[PDB]
Amino acid sequence: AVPFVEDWDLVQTLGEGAYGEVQLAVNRVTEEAVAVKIVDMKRAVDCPENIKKEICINKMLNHENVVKFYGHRREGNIQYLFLEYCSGGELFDRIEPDIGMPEPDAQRFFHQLMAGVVYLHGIGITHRDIKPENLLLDERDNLKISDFGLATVFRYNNRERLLNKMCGTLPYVAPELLKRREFHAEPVDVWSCGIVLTAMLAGELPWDQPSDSCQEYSDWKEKKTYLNPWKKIDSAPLALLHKILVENPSARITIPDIKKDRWYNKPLK
Numbered sequence: 636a637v638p639f640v641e642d643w644d645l646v647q648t649l650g651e652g653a654y655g656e657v658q659l660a661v662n663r664v665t666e667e668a669v670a671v672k673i674v675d676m677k678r679a680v681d682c683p684e685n686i687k688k689e690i691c692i693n694k695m696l697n698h699e700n701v702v703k704f705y706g707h708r709r710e711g712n713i714q715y716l717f718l719e720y721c722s723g724g725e726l727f728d729r730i731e732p733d734i735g736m737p738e739p740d741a742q743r744f745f746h747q748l749m750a751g752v753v754y755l756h757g758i759g760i761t762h763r764d765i766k767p768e769n770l771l772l773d774e775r776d777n778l779k780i781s782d783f784g785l786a787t788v789f790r791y792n793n794r795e796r797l798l799n800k801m802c803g804t805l806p807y808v809a810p811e812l813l814k815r816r817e818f819h820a821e822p823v824d825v826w827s828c829g830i831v832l833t834a835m836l837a838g839e840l841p842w843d844q845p846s847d848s849c850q851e852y853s854d855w856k857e858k859k860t861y862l863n864p865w866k867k868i869d870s871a872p873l874a875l876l877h878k879i880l881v882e883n884p885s886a887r888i889t890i891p892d893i894k895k896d897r898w899y900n901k902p903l904k
């Protein structure tokens with residue numbers, strides 16, 4: 636038994652918000668770095684319930700493109716979650732405003748993103764809030780899906796549960812969430828991934844939200860890809876977006892088919 640190995644020093648605030656804050660912790664002995672999410676179980680139906688679900692889901696996660704879950708510590712009202720420290724930071728910061736990033740980097744990040752999503756969907760888990768700020772990068776620039784505070788189970792005992800809860804982030808949310816009472820979970824995550832792809836290649840989001848009243852969204856459905864925000868995206872990745880950002884979730888391309896898309900399998904480019 637090595638003394639002090641259980642002592643972690645909080646040396647930097649990684650993130651802060653409703654949930655509370657995320658601090659970088661370094662092991663007193665080994666100097667190992669991890670991310671510690673601090674969530675004060677206040678209110679009632681709030682944290683006490685929400686944080687418990689987030690924990691159960693994290694305990695199911697084990698994939699190279701998903702933030703690792705080390706464990707959790709509860710000290711009365713305060714709840715501590717020991718998660719993977721990704722020194723690379725948020726993919727969000729790798730996105731140059733109005734520019735994006737080199738197509739090959741985006742393709743690489745997109746490959747890793749799909750890998751993570753396939754994994755989650757494979758074990759019946761939907762994230763429900765995929766966006767650049769939740770996509771982390773490690774020291775080698777490997778994409779990691781993070782924050783399962785909005786995640787939930789959509790498949791259990793081989794039976795799919797349709798969803799109806801409106802959650803996520805408007806710019807990334809699928810249109811069916813704003814138009815239908817119930818919807819299939821998977822196409823919703825594929826959609827947000829497409830908006831993330833769009834952001835990586837153009838450095839701007841296509842619309843405030845996917846609805847009629849939204850100008851750019853209507854233009855997209857009218858295929859006005861000329862000059863408009865899609866003007867900055869090469870034709871190959873654009874052909875993929877045309878298949879992902881499809882109004883009808885039933886007609887939307889699935890991940891197995893995205894894996895077959897030409898740009899997706901295009902070397903480097």
Ligand SMILES: C[C@H]1CC[C@@H](NCc2ccc3c(c2)Cc2c(-c4ccc(C(=O)O)cc4)n[nH]c2-3)CC1
Nearest residue numbers: 648649657670702718719720721722724781782783
């Ligand atoms: C304070 C300044 C310097 C650091 C910057 N942040 C970069 C950064 C670097 C490494 C990070 C995170 C952010 C966020 C995070 C997480 C993380 C894991 C899991 C969750 C979650 O489960 O919700 C949230 C955040 N692990 N590693 C990191 C912000 C301004």
